[PDB]
Structures are given as C-alpha cells and as structure tokens.
Symmetry: C5
Subunit: 114 residues, 5 copies
Amino acid sequence: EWTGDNTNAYYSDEVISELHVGQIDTSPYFCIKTVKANGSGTPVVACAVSKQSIWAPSFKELLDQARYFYSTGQSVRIHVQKNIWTYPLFVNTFSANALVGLSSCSATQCFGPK
Amino acid sequence: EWTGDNTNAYYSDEVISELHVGQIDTSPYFCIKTVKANGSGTPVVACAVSKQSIWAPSFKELLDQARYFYSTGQSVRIHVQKNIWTYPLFVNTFSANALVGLSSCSATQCFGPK
Amino acid sequence: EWTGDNTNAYYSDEVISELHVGQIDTSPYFCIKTVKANGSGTPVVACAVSKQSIWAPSFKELLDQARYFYSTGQSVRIHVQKNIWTYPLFVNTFSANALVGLSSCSATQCFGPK
Amino acid sequence: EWTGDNTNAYYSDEVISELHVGQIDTSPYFCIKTVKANGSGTPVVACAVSKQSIWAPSFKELLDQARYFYSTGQSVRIHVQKNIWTYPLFVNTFSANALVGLSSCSATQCFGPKL
Amino acid sequence: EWTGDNTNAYYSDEVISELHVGQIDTSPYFCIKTVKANGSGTPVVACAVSKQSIWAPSFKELLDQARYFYSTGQSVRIHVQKNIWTYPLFVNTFSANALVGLSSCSATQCFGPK
C-alpha cells in the first residue's frame, strides 16, 4: 500500500481548519477537517485511529504532521482512503475517511502524489 | 467505549485556563481547568491518569493536545466521563472527571461528538 | 504516593528562571531554579532524575512541563519532595529536592494541591 | 556507514521548501524538497522511510530536524545517499535519494561533513 | 559518572550557533557548535551518539535540550567529555567531544556544575 495509490483520493490547496483528539475501542484517534484555501468547495473530514486499519503504523507521524500544518495554516494536499471507519456514530460525527497523507502546496503544485 | 458515547458529558466553547502535571500511585497524570469563553457558568476540571481507567491509552495524545490548546487559548469542546477518579483528596483538589477528548471549535459548531 | 501529599512542600507564584539538563549514574536528569515573580524570597531548586526515586515514572512529563513553563515564564506553583537526591556534589550544585509537580498560577490561586 | 561517507552526495546552502508525510509498505515516511537559498540550480528531493534502508535508525531524528529547518527556512546542507528507494511510482513522484543528514549553514560554511 | 565530574570540561556564556543531525554505525547522532555570546574565543564542538559511550542514556534529552537552546539563542554553559569519539573522519569533521550537559546562564552565573 502507498499514500499515492490511485485508489486513494486527494484534495489540493486545502487548509486544516479543525482538529479533534479522542479514544475509541482502546485506541487513541484524531480527526481533522480541511477546507479549500480559497473558500470554495466542500470540507474534507478524515481520521486516523492508532490500532486500526493498514494505516495504523503512521498514526503518530500523521498526528504530528497534522498538528504541524494545523498550526501553520499553510495550504496542503490531503490524501485519504474512503470508506474505512465503520462505527456508525463515529462516521456520522466525522467520516469514514482514513487520513493517509499530507503534502505541502505552493502556488502552482503540491509536493506529493497526484 | 468512545469519546462520543452519550454517557459522557461535554462542554463547548471553553478555554483552557489552568494546567497541572504530577504523579499519583506510580502514574503520571495531568489536570486542566477550563472556563466558558464568555466568562459565564462554572469552571470545568478534568484529569487524565497515565496508568488508570479505560482512557489510559490516550494519555499522551490528550496531554499533548491539552498543551496545544492551552498555549493558543482557543475555544474548545472538552469531553469528560464523570465519577471516575476515586482518591478523595485528589477529587477534592481537582475532580472525578476523566478527560476523554478535546475538540477545536469554529464560530458556530465544535468539531466533535455532541 | 501523590504530588499533593502533605509531606511534600510547594511554593506558589514562582517563575522558572533556570534550566539544566545532564546525566548522573546512568540517568538523564534535569534541574530547575525558580524565583518569586515579585523578586522577593529565596530561590527554589529542584531536580528530576530518570529511573531514580519513586517519582521516576513522571520524569518525561515533568521535563516537558518544566520546559513549557520555562519558555512562557508564567507564574507557577512548584511541588517538591525534600531530601531525595543524596549524591553530595550534585546536592551542593543543585539541591536534594525531587521535583514532583508543576501547576499554573494564572486566574485564581494556583491550580494544584494546596 | 556514516552520513559523511564520500559515497554520499550533499548540497550546501539549500532551503527546505516542501514537506510531505505519508506511508508506504507498512512504513511511515517523509520527503522534502530543497532549493538553493540564492535561487540558483535545480531542486533536491530526498526521503526517509521508517524501518527501511540502513538509515532506518535515524528516521525520527531526521523527521524532527527536517520539520525544524523547514519551519525556520534557514540555509542547510542536505546529505543524501542516491539510488536507495526502488519503488518506481514513489521514485517518480519523489526520488530514490535517502535522506541521511541535515546541517545548518553559516555565511561561509555548513556544519557537517564535506569531501 | 556525572555531567559535573571535574574530569569533564565546560564553557560558560556560550550560544549554540550550529546544529547537525546524522547517523554513524547504525546510531543516530547529533552535533552542536557553540561560541561565546560575545563572539570572542574559539568554537566548542560536541556530539552525542545514541548507542555509544557512557552518555548514551541522555541522547534524547540532550538532543531536545540542544534544539531548545538553539532555537532561543540564549546564553548557556556547555559541558563535554573530551577524547570520546574515535572514528577519525568524524573527529576531523566535528570533534572527539561528547556532549554531557547544557545549563542556562544568567548575566552573572550559569545554572550548573562549575
């Protein structure tokens, strides 16, 4: 598996606008919400769960990187894998998107798979 | 179990106004005090204990997140489970509230379970 | 044992004015010096030593918290247990106080055991 | 092995201009892009991958350091070992360069190995 | 062993002016260069190697502390043990000095062994 697999979706020129930290089924997790830097489009929500999914090994790094980009407010490309989380109240509150990557974005391109 | 379980309480648009770090029964712990952003109502106190309760696995993440929100002074939603801590002097100093989650808040809603 | 045990001493409205990191007898350690915010009184010196004393489990958290409070220079309450470190040159340079807790002192009285 | 081995390449007075974090084959990884502080030359891309390559033990330290140098925008010397990552789509997106060191730079030199 | 052993050398009223991170023989390491806060004298260069020397246990703490002092540019006392590192090209590039401690410095004294 790879962040850049074409079965993963991504959204460019986003800003991380919200951050949540909690626990579910003995596992710490976090979620983020991102919106287009230019105000257009629909927000993206994605979560990472510490002991769950194939993306579990990157939990800490993604959390640190999410925090980093959240704090700078810079434009980023967010990479997700859809339909991963299954607990209905959790999905309803957040989404079924697994966070699988974060790339910085300049004015022209983003530094990551496309 | 989940941060968003309806058996948990939450308080929106709070600002973390105090932070304490210590140890009890071989376990590091931290507590925070939060107050409504507009100054109304009564303060919320909640603690996380590294080797105690079902919320133990999230100790580090919660600590880190609390620190962050404490440093920015931003409005957040705090999620707690009541009546968890039992050492009477501890409870009297702080509270019996276990900290189980922290969410950023926009101007309208908070990014977390409700 | 608890940070708030009445056999521990504490000092309110202090500012962390110095920070030292080193190693002794296979253990990383840190020490802090605190002084009254208003300039009065005598400095307090306290140390935490990795894997040494009953307070060992909280080393990391205390180190991080000391660093945080050191960087903001905010008013704090420092909690110590006296007569713990015994290595004489170490005690002479710093003190025998084990650092066992740190509390913020912003709004009302300090946020910790009293 | 050593960051300063003469079989490694390095580029001085670079600024970390981009940062990416993701996962590949069970491993968290990060990549950076750097460009000359004075605007000359061509960008350098390098990646570090957790638990992969001989440079695996330094993953955490390098990630933290890259984040720091990225946030300040200061001039650095970047040390890489070429032709380490082999997964073709990954390489095409980024490069085959393993990141093996980062050094701060002054006006006259960088604080790290050179040939 | 102790940071403050009189067989270790130290240099007061220094500023950490450079930072390097790398790997040697499967070990992450870092080096720092320090100069007198007033610019006089000769730089001090010292390194820590995570799996080498009696000082290995303090690697992480020293790395964090070096980073901290480096980011503030504040005056410090640096403590080293001479003639520790032995790989000749490494010593040529940096030095044989092991970093064994860092102390903050006020205008008068430094907060550490002397």
